Every structure is written in structure tokens, then in C-alpha cells.
Amino acid sequence: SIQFTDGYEVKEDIGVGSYSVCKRCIHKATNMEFAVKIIDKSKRDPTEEIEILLRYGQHPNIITLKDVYDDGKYVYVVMELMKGGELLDKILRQKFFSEREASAVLFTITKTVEYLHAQGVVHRDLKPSNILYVDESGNPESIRICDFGFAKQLRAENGLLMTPCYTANFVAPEVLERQGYDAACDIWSLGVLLYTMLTGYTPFANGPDDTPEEILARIGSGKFSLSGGYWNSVSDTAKDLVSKMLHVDPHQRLTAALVLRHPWIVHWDQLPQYQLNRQDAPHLVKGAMAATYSALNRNQ
């Protein structure tokens, strides 16, 4: 059709990946700035990702697609910009962040994942850096799940999209099996998010200089300190939830739905409103956080 540069003015970068790139751009006609993802078709096929952005991008807590282009070589995905930075980091930098707000945030994030899983979609990369605030309003309504570059639609053999209910069609078990994992895998990530918000540090990582082996060793042990120091002033209700989200066995791990039925999310009005006793090392956590997912994606 037309072309991207004809309607957008490219600005500075936001995040440069091996396959894709994200830069800030401004819709010339309206002067309204956005974020544009440039994917190298020759290196990766962005179909899957866009298809998901087109269908479920309408969700309030899912980064919305505003326009698309394709000059043959690359594909420009014009999405909404996030003027609120990383959700986790921002929260970690709130010294008085209560325990009630955690339930609020996690709920909004969870409510979104439940929908995705319900539609047969798994993020497969639901790390903290991919959960930003659209603005600085603070209210959970401004939460956005982004970067679906690793998302995956549950489908059949004949390119037919499927849902976790309708199984009357041909869906290979090994394909359905991994979906059951990726689902609980997304949950696991949310468990990490929660754990970090409550205490102010990663459950399996200490900093950016943690060997992938020791990190995996920790994750592999299944056990993780849910008490002492920063956990002292945390609700047992909250601690109960975390232990079930980070449950080593994915089969015995809570599902998005089950998490939403949990009392810490249901009876939120009975949660504390006073500040939490956390560690104030947002940057350190950022490294430890990246140090983890890196160890997991070492075979990707």
C-alpha cells in the first residue's frame, strides 16, 4: 500500500533486539507520539505476533496496535507508547507501597493472562521488563502487557486456532502438553513478580553477577525463603499465594483462574494499607531479574 515514513517521524530507540527493534515515533498528522516495532522479516516471521496483537490488542491491559506497514523487507508495528516505565521498577521505587496495592496490580495483570490462556494464548516471556505503565497515573487501569514476540496461539494441525475447551478437533497431545506448561510457565513468572513486589528482591537471584547454574540450581530446589527479614511483616495469606505460584511442579501450580479465586485477591479489602518492609535496591533487582530469565532462555 503506502509507506510508514510517510506518516511517522522516527525518533530515538527504546529497545534493540537481535531480531526486532523498537523506536519512538510521532504521527505527523496528529503530532501524537507512539512506539513502532521494526521486525526483520528475513530473520523472523512476525505473523504470529501481529495476529495476536490484532485480535487481543483490544484488551485494556494489553498494548494496543494502532497501525502497521510492510515495505517488503521489514514490518513496522505501530503500537501505543508507555509513558510509565517498567511496572515492577516503578513499584519497587515506592518506599511506602502497601500490600493491598500488590493485590490490586497482580489482579489486573492476572485478569489479563486468564483471558489470554482462555483464548488459547500463552505469553512465554512474561518477564517484569515486559510489563509497563501506559502513563504515570498510577492506577492499574494504566497497566499494559507488551512484547508478544514469543506468544503462541493454541491451534490444530490444519492451521485452525483452538481454545482450551474445544478439543473435539485434532490437536496433537505433545502440542497440547507444552501449552499446559507454557500456561503455568507464565504463572510462574507472575509468581516471581509478586515475590519481588512484596519483599523487594528476586526469589532465585541476588544480582546480575549470578551464574546461570546457581540460579537454575535454586529454581530446581523448589524451596525459597518465604520468611525472615522482609517477609516478617507480610501476610500469611499473601505468602500462601506466592508458594503456590512458584510451585516447582507445574501440575500442582495454580492456574490464572485459581489464582484469581485466591483469598488474597478476593478479600483484598482485608489487606494492609501501611508501607511494606522491603529492600531498596531496584537496579540490583533489575540485574538479578535479567540474570534469571537469561539462564532460562540460554537454550532459545
Ligand SMILES: *[C@@H](c1ccc2[nH]nc(-c3cc(OC)c(OC)c(OC)c3)c2c1)[C@@H](C#N)C(=O)NC(C)(C)CO
Ligand atoms: C519494543 C517496544 C515496543 C512497543 C513499546 N511501547 N512502549 C515501549 C517502551 C518500553 C520501555 O521499556 C521499559 C520504555 O522505557 C525506556 C519506554 O519509554 C518510556 C517505552 C515499547 C517498546 C519491544 C517490543 N515489542 C521490544 O523491543 N521487544 C524485543 C526486545 C525486540 C523482543 O521482542
